[PDB]
Symmetry: C3
Subunit: 552 residues, 3 copies
């Protein structure tokens, strides 16, 4: 029977049969079942002997610090893991019972409670985010460092599926071809909730967050250091949701970390959603103005690519952000293509784009900067193209809506205040035959505004105005020009009062020679001393003559 049993049954060991996790790991051949809660010490390291193991978790790993898994064979999987801290830290909750952000430091301090969830441990970034909070926080709420972290170290082809926890983190250090799949809403601790860090060894590749969601955490929900997906774009974040990140929902790191670059290239960021981050929805920058460095150890030098002009080459498409307190969508880079980005209902700005020679297609920035902290709703520094930009939802100082001074833009839609648009060039080169349809007014308008002349006043207009009442079947058309900073000061009319005639403006005094522009044209003007209209005529040969046009 022994011989036949060894052949016909599935091999699995279970933690309930062993005093330590290493003892279970050493015994395992195929399956390993975590069927009892396991208290680990920070830095406890398990050697899985290169075995291709299917680890099924049905209980908790309990501990502050890192439980470190090593030497898992390619194809290993870890399902259902649940990390939990031993410490219950002090957390802040900078939002109200109506889900309004709290921005006042004293109000934020008043939210303090001891809990493993429903808030986060204050960080040094909170000292900037909530000015004055550093002074107001009690000592027990500063400098806390509670996270229970599963660390997969120097493994290839390992997947963590359906992970969850409380004050929980997941770290893949020096790994390749690893994935965090269908995260089951872990509640975060002090460190990032999901981290792929490849500061030592080869640049990270094949590392993804696929599906799932996270909540809370003091810093970013999903973050990458020194990963390069290659031209194949083999890595990144797809199908992911982040809620209430203490920093950002999805972050590509900037600057030097330790002795080398933390930056990232060639990753996918797609089909993902970030809601209510304290800082950014997506932060896809590689150079940061928060800690400026004059070189890039381990990366391209400044001499090759200036600050914010790295050839980052990320594949970025179909992203949604709502409720950001900092910036909904932030990035830098040169030669970038970005598409189908929707940022709505944000207390902070919608987009902050330190990009050059880049293209943005179908962007929607809807009711952002709702607090008015920031100078604009969308900012672009460099020479970029925007093709399709929706601005303004239902929310109404002097802050700009779009400040993109070197960018050429087409296809704005929405009830934007034109004085709050600043671009290099705005144009609709390819419209068809047009109709302007006016509702709730006695007139329809096609206005012109020359921003060099004035950003706040229309310089001319083509109007149609009702004659008499509704259903009169009659209107007059009006062609106007600005004078003395008074819109519509001078105008020509057709059919005013249904008269069937053109009303023609004339110069109110003797016209100077230089008032007339073109040959074979005349300019009527008033001669008060004889009660007559004269005409300044530029003849077909270009010479001037003055004629009498209308007399008593």
């Amino acid at each position: 029977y022994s011989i036949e049993a060894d052949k016909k049954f599935k091999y699995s060991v279970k933690l309930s049969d062993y005093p330590t996790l290493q003892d279970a790991a050493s015994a395992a051949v195929d399956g390993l079942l975590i069927d009892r809660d396991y208290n680990f010490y920070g830095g406890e390291t398990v050697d899985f002997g290169g075995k291709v193991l299917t680890i099924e978790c049905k209980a908790k790993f309990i501990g502050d610090g890192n439980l470190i898994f090593t030497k898992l064979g390619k194809g290993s999987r870890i399902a259902g893991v649940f990390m939990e801290s031993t410490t219950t830290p002090w957390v802040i909750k900078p939002w109200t019972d109506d889900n309004q952000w709290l921005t006042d430091a004293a109000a934020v301090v008043a939210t303090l409670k001891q809990s493993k969830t429903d808030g986060y441990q204050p960080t040094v970034s909170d000292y900037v985010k909530f000015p004055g909070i550093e002074t107001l926080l009690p000592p027990n709420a500063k400098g806390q460092n509670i996270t229970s972290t599963l660390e997969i170290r120097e493994c290839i082809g390992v997947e963590v599926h359906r992970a969850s926890g409380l004050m929980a983190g997941f770290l893949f250090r020096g790994c390749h071809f690893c994935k965090m799949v269908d995260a089951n809403n872990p509640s975060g601790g002090k460190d990032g909730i999901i981290t792929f860090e490849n500061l030592s060894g080869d640049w990270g590749k094949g590392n993804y967050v696929i599906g799932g969601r996270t909540s809370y955490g003091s810093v970013s929900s999903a973050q990458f250091l020194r990963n390069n997906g290659g031209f194949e774009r083999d890595g990144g974040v797809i199908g992911f949701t982040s809620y209430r990140a203490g920093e950002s929902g999805v972050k590509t790191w900037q600057g030097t970390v330790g002795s080398t670059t933390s930056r990232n290239y060639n990753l996918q960021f797609r089909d993902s959603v970030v809601i209510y981050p304290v800082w950014d929805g997506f932060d896809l920058g590689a150079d940061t103005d928060m800690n400026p460095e004059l070189d890039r150890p381990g990366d391209y030098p400044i001499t090759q690519y200036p600050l914010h002009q790295l050839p980052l080459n990320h594949l970025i498409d179909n992203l949604l952000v709502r409720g950001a307190l900092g910036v909904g969508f932030g990035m830098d880079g040169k030669g970038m293509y970005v598409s189908n980005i929707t940022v709505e209902d944000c207390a902070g700005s919608g987009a902050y784009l330190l990009t050059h020679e880049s293209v943005f297609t179908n962007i929607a920035i809807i009711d952002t900067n709702t607090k008015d902290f920031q100078a604009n709703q969308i900012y672009i520094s460099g020479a970029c193209r925007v093709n399709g930009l929706r601005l303004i939802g239902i929310r109404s100082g002097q802050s700009l809506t779009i400040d993109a001074p070197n960018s050429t833009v087409s296809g704005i839609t929405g009830m934007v205040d034109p004085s709050r648009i600043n671009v290099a060039n705005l144009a609709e080169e390819g419209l068809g035959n047009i109709r302007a349809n006016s509702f709730g007014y006695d007139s329809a308008a096609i206005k012109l505004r020359i921003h060099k002349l004035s950003k706040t006043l229309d310089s001319g207009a083509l109007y149609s105005h009702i004659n008499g009442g509704a259903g009169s079947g009659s209107a007059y058309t009006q062609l106007t020009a600005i004078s003395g900073s008074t819109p519509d000061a001078v105008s020509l009319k057709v059919n005013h009062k249904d008269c069937r005639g053109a009303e023609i403006p004339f110069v109110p005094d003797i016209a100077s020679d230089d008032f007339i522009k073109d040959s074979s044209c005349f300019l009527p003007y008033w001669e008060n001393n004889s009660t007559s209209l004269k005409a300044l005529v530029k003849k077909p040969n270009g010479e001037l003559v003055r004629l009498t046009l209308a007399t008593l």
Copy 2:
């Protein structure tokens, strides 16, 4: 050997070794394999002893009514389940072999067959949908109630994966943190195919439909009662496809059910598709006009939030509907944000939006109301903002396209008939320099229409018309105004017949004093009694004088 075998083998029991499902459940420790078909009686209840079980199904649960699973531990999973009724009911199939909807009751009755699929059992809603069908249906086709339902009752953290079946339903009653994942196209019965119902106990939270698809069913494919995702938006429907729902693809319930509210708050509805529903694609309403109630037991009172103005706060983005017989996309609520909704090729209306102070961004409503049942393609009752609205595909009475009388709209695209637009305000405030490009005409046009004056006639225009033939290198520009309900009745021309001159309309009789509008302007008029043009002049000082302008 016994001691070593107990340590090295995976624990699983299988239904083939037990006379009842409860006997198997009681024996199970880790795995439970369903390896024989199992006939259950309606209401048969299995107590899983709080155990965290991995239930792998490789055979059918056969029965009319509910198989009830209770006391599953958090982390339990049920994979591959297949439910099948014992009864083969009478089903209707209200569509043709060319996939046209049948709307005639007699034609629908003619489709009757006995089958567990390819149709659905008639409901009381069919009596409204197909008027007269209540009288025409035979008795054996009315009042049928066949569903084989897996009921997960009062469990936390249970997931049903890759479920399928025939006349099949899946019910999570009083559950939290449960998921219906990758539904493998179950064919529905009389009840909803996937239901999260939390009428008793705490409001449902953490309950999702993720991925997968369903077909048929008499009512809605995926539906929620008394769920609230919280600010974290922890619940809803993501990545799901519904085909041929007898009611709607995705439904948030409205009104009172039993003694309390069935409504829902703070859910996600994203990245999902509904095709060929008999009623709606997505029905995200919370108050229903189908059964109006004057109060809301267990919810906000009418005094706090009027009908259709609940702060529902759902996260709604990236939805597709095609082929709806009722409304593609229906909702209500106040303060809603909705984005990236595409509704196309629907016999019923595209969108029915009983919303107030809400924002709709990038909506496409393309070839809907193709039967002409309804008054419009998109309706909005309250004071909302629409930023980006695509209307009209290729399909061509007096029904409106958009009736949104309190809404401010920007960015309509498509070959909409302007007379079929009704909004509070329509504007393109932020276009750049413009070009109107005309193809297939001898002219280009920029028209104006004042809807208060006339919804069907343009009130003025700026035209450019070819002089002579193609390649003449010559055109004339024309500025027109409506008179006597005749578009373009009165006009000024520049370069007609390549003459290089302006043709100026004059008043055809003696002009009244009040015909002239502005100071320092003149108005030419005809004096037939002397064959001369006169000028009514409003001098720079505002006083009137009449002068002779042109004479024999």
Copy 3:
């Protein structure tokens, strides 16, 4: 103990206990574990006895040719499979270290190396793609046929999950209700990476690619032959990524294969991404001009549906293509609805649409045809509707941007050159009140262009031009018309030089009777022989008279 062990343990056999895969398959009851590498011979066939098996792979299947799995029960699953060829073939790599495509045949030949990855084996299509390469390739690099293929033959309800490999392929032949799920980036061989082929038996249905990704391969990444999803749209590709297909990312086959149709109907193509295909991103055509046939054995005849006019009825939405060398998005068919397609940064054309009576909603074609091989960026042959079309990113001969000569289009955005637009009709019927905002110029413009007259010259304009300098508070409005192929040749001005008057162009010589268009209008003209302006008057009764208008 034996009796109790047989009841309490999970059944699984493992390949390490058997000399052949068939011996393991015959012994299996529930699980089968592939725990040793297995060398198979091409055509090696395994009979799984109709058993519903869970096959867990933790090692390689090694072999050139096909490993054929048969008689798997419905619900069977195969996870983690890794296919690898025994041969290391010669592969080409037609792209540079800066990820530019190589188009020169000699440069492509220079890339030749022996590898199982990082390139592909040349095919007969490469002879067309890289002209001259057929002559330049060495014999050892032509006619190679290396693929290691897992073939699932004539099974229902089988799923392959997390598959990978090197020179790897996956073939479902004569299968139904089967799925390729979460492909773990297999690197392809000579044949398609994922193929559903149903040339014999019933039309394929229920067959999907869901999630995952592939890299390389000589032909298409995911492809279908003779599948019909039904009205239920039960099959297709959802959530998939293809990189560097040697042919196309996703292909529906065209034409006859063997003795019957290879075409496909009623499939979904959604939420998917194709990057850097050598030919197309998505090829959703059913009739091909590459091998024209005059009939359609096994499909609709040409007499019923002309070439390219099949009622294909695919559900097509939310697709992204970047980096295509051939066409980003190709299709044919009649009565098609297509939505939310984004094609960017392609060396080849963006879209090639041999469609009729079809509707395209929210299309973006951004920086395509960047090499200039092709005649246009987007082509449409038949009578279609386009509602929303974004054109031009940041890239700048005589090639058209859109050539859609029978199509009616609305909602173009972007810096398109108007001379490179060709459509049947272009119109914005439903805009609101309009403002044209000009940045970086001393004027704002609303231009008109009659393409029948000239595609390259505006025929008229409404301008506003600054008077004096910025902040003068003054501008003049100008209404212009083209003459002698000189834009703006003839114009009327209002407020030039802040004169508050209208400058009126007059006919430079004696006006002919036919120069005046409308009754009750006058046309000023020059009489040089008396230094006077005359007026050609068309009286209210329609008769002509000449009057003196201005005199010395």
